[PDB]
Amino acid sequence: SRANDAPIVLLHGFTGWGREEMFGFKYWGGVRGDIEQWLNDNGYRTYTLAVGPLSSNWDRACEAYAQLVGGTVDYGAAHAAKHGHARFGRTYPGLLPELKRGGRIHIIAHSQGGQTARMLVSLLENGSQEEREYAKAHNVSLSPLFEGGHHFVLSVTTIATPHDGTTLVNMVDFTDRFFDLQKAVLKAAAVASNVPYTSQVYDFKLDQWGLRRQPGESFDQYFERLKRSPVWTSTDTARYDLSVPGACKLNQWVKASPNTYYLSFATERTYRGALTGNYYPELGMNAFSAVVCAPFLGSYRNATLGIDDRWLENDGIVNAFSMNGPKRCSTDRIVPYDGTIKKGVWNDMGTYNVDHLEVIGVDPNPLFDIRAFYLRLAEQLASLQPHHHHHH
Template sequence: MRRLPILRLSVILVLTMLLSMTSFSGSLFAVTPLTEVDQDHPYNRSVKEAEQEKNINPQLDIKLTSDKNANNYPIVLVHGLGGFKDLYGIPYWGGLTNIPRDLRNKGYEVYVAEIGPVSSNWDRAAELYAQIKGGTVDYGEAHAAEHGHLRFGRTYDGLYPEWGEVNPKTGKVNKVHLIGHSLGGPTSRALIQLLEEGHPAEVSTTSATKLSPLFQGKKEWVHSAVSLSSPHDGSTATYYIDNLIPHIQEILAVFAALQGNHSTVEFDFQLDHWGLKREAGESFDSYVNRVKKSNIWKTKDTAKWDARPIGAQELNEWIQGSSSVYYFSLSTEQTYRSIFTGYHKPELFMNPIFYDGSRFMGRHRSSTDGIHTGSDWWENDGVVNTNSMDGPTLHSDEQIVTYDGSAERGKWNHLGTLNSVDHLDVIGIGVRDMRWLFRDMAEMLTSLPD
């Protein structure tokens, strides 16, 4: 398929160079003086060398499964941990290249979800359901009681209210394609599981008249699910990052800098069901401090837990692949193996906010929570171990196959690995234009037969 020329995003290049001096686990705008930067730091190079990144052309040929336009189901984009729809006018998907807008201009029906950035996959799945279908978020009576938060959340009009209804023109159920980045992949899996199988604890706890349709099962409403750089087996970065909030603040800094300094931070943690709604006139610092001190972090009902290998393993135990869904996965990496130590180190152009975490993942060995992580976990994209991205394997019997143009339902069709691409590069946050990737994926998804 045709490849688009690399877009010259000089503003992001300058930002990336500035962020090379920023501590991965520090505060929002904590800057380390140049004299204190480790000489081995990959961004302690010239701007001229950094320009070379824009000439890296990831190789990936996504073949069509059948004829074009075999279906016209909408595409729903599901962000990952710390994500959002847009911030300061900059979209999460594509940044200045605005991938959703580009796909719409190409004729695809595209919706962008905005769910809890630090919430568990269960809670995010409940929010995703309400956002697409419309209505009030129902986290489940049993689930809410178990974890100590409110059962109901926000109310939405619905991105695609006709979802799940029979289309009078085709006589078929209206389905969607889900594309999830990072934690958005496991969140999509959780949604499919609940839609199709329901949940026994919710059925036994809640009366039939009050049970959310999400937990009733028998809803084959998802045609395909694509995961991009997703931690299906968790990420060892969680052993390095004890507190998610500073990590998210670093990401916010990227978007804030793209639009200049902002005195007002509009980021929403969407934790209303935990009693953590940002009050009118409340400063962002005050809001963040309340989130940090919340009892939410003492539970397993968070993205922090789900992103750990043990959390991912627990998720894999109750989520089973659906025989009605086409699953796809795409891996990324931006490390190299040291010829001296065998450890994996960040490549020259990895986003500097990921450098320290990547270096940790590239050499970490442990047997934590009964899960052994060794050298096969070292390759990474700065946030997620590459071997975790092709599909679930920890306590999972789901099959992973290489996609060759013939997609298999109920199996993980691995599209391949994008080399020299970090965790934000893949969604177009960086100096490279990734619209070609999403165009190719959209064309492939709409070629999938019913």
């Protein structure tokens, strides 16, 4: 039964766009429909965040914070100075000013969104010592996000999140293939990559880096430029955070708040080979991933990275092992869901037989009741109690 009225906020990964983008084709729903609408139609107030898909989780967290409460994005003086990008970014009206007044939210996150949501919680709750220290030392102002003390988040749910990174980054042609994945997703939405559309269509939101698709430029061409840009070559990137070492570094500081409930969903769409311990893409997996990424994921080992047989099972984009919660370079705790949802630890909800894109409806799969999945989830989140008392 319903113990909380908090709104839900959807958060995309290394691929994603706002509701008005991509000619209305939604990331949360894809060919299946409008997940946000379904949830709202069903009594679950839901909103959608849209942040830089290729940007660092930090940047995304800063973007999210402003998008939620409103204002100009502030990445932090220290950070900015460190990485060489703008301190201030775009301005938002603010989706939920109730947060400033004392409300809370449930964040449902997909892919790299998981990492972002985690970071956002940590920043809200703890701030950034490094940003505070930098402020006092250089006499610059400080965003509230870096102070600590915010209690905006009741829960964080992650679906197909590379909490320990993904070996996808280790392919020799990764750079080219990653961008081909963006093209695939455009394809899914009925958008071509070799057309210089005048309308924006997919805004990567690279204001901080001063990058934007130029008049007369196709996504194919733009992507060529992005590959040689700081959003691809610097450590302040999704690319870095997606990596095993990257995710490790992130886990080192991004911890679970004892005040927040976390839920994790894993995804897999592979089968185990006969004579080899390798995993292969199942029938139905999205074409792109099946041909281009899944073989690699299902067969790549690396002792120095600790990539062993456990990491081979995948959803075509991310290793299933890296999905139940941060384990590499982490103090976070993960507990198998047994019926009761626990606060301050990762409630591992299991593994579902759906691929990376099928789970958000961007790739079809008729045997996966996507509406039911998200509706059940909503019901769960709504059932969370603000507080607990010990009992037998």
